[PDB]
Structure formats: C-alpha cells, structure tokens
Design a protein around this nucleic acid. Sequence first.
DNA 1: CGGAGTGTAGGC
DNA 2: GCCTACACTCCG
Lengths: 68, 68
Amino acid sequence: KRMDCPALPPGWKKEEVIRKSGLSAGKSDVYYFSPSGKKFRSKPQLARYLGNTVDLSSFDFRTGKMMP
Amino acid sequence: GKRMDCPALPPGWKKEEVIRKSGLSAGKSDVYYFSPSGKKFRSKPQLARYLGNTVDLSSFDFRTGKMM
DNA sequence: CGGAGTGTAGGC
DNA sequence: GCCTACACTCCG
C-alpha cells in the first residue's frame, strides 16, 4: 500500500508495514517516501530533510494527520 | 584475511572479521565462521541449524564470538 | 555492500 | 509497560 499523504507536500507517500515475527509480531512500522523515493522512518529524520518548508509540530507520524 | 581460533565454539572452529571498504556501510564489518570441513557460516540461525542440539548457542554473541 | 525487517535502549 | 527512533542482522 503506497498511499499519498495529503498533509505533506505533493508526491509524498506513506506506507504501513505489519511485522510478521519476533517479539513485535503484529505491531506496525510506518514509512514515508519523498517524491524522489528516499525512505523515512521517523519524524526527526523527516524534519531534518524538510527543514522550514513544512511545519511538522502537530504532525502525527503514525497516522499521517495533523493534530489540532 | 585471518581465521583466528574461536576458543568458545568446539575445537577446529575459526572466526573471521572483514571490514566493508566503501558505500553507506563503509567501516562496519561482516563476521564469518568456518567449521572443520570449512563451510562458511554468515549468521547465527545458520550456525545453529548446522549444530542443532550439539551446542547451546543461546548465550552466543555472533559478532564477538563470546558468551553472555 | 544494500536494505527490508526485526531488535532494543531509553524517554516517556 | 509502551513507543519512538534508529542500530543491526541476515541473506540476496
């Protein structure tokens, strides 16, 4: 599932992957992809990439949604 | 490279550490193991399978070659 | 040597 | 005790 993520700029996509095994079996990891395709696995990695082009203070990494 | 006797596995067992010379993981290493026959092992689950019940590798640290 | 998938420390 | 964030494995 490579989903657009409306609350980021155009081209940015979100993907949620189910862990198949280990002690976190059934938990999920959320990945984001830039228009170029670079993969991001956290909020600060995403903030380091984006800088002041986007405010991410209210941005929920898990859901891809801004939190009012 | 250098196979050095790994005193924590049965006798005849050699370890070898090989530095990655470039790319993103430049300067990390892969650790390899050799049986007496000289089969190369690249992981802890593969080493466990070859050995099964004959050796308890639960406390075995694959990277260092020591117990834990 | 890469990198998807899992381990796991530390903040909470 | 749970989650975030990123290190590390393992096998291609």
